[PDB]
Amino acid sequence: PAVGVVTVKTEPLQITTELPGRTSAYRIAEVRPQVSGIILK
Amino acid sequence: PAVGVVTVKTEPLQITTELPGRTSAYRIAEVRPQVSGIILK
């Protein structure tokens, strides 16, 4: 009986959440006419 | 034992994005009355 052995200790682990998501500008503005009428150009 | 083969001949490639693009009118501008009231003619 001789086996490869790895004695266990405390190992700091920074592995953490890998979770979902969607992305957005910021920077996610719009252009809304504040003056009404016909678009000339 | 002979074998069919083909030597290389890369270098000339043209790739493109082909797909059913969505066409649209150049300028539509539906006519939305600047005024209220009945439609005469």
Curated annotation (Swiss-Prot), chains A, B:
It comes from the Bacteria. It is found in: Cell inner membrane. Monomeric in solution. Homotrimeric; interacts independently with AcrB and TolC as well as AcrZ. Part of the AcrA-AcrB-TolC efflux pump. AcrA-AcrB-AcrZ-TolC is a drug efflux protein complex with broad substrate specificity that uses the proton motive force to export substrates. This subunit may act as an adapter protein that links AcrB and TolC stably together. Belongs to the membrane fusion protein (MFP) (TC 8.A.1) family. This is Multidrug efflux pump subunit AcrA. The lineage of its organism: Bacteria, Pseudomonadati, Pseudomonadota, Gammaproteobacteria, Enterobacterales. The gene is acrA.
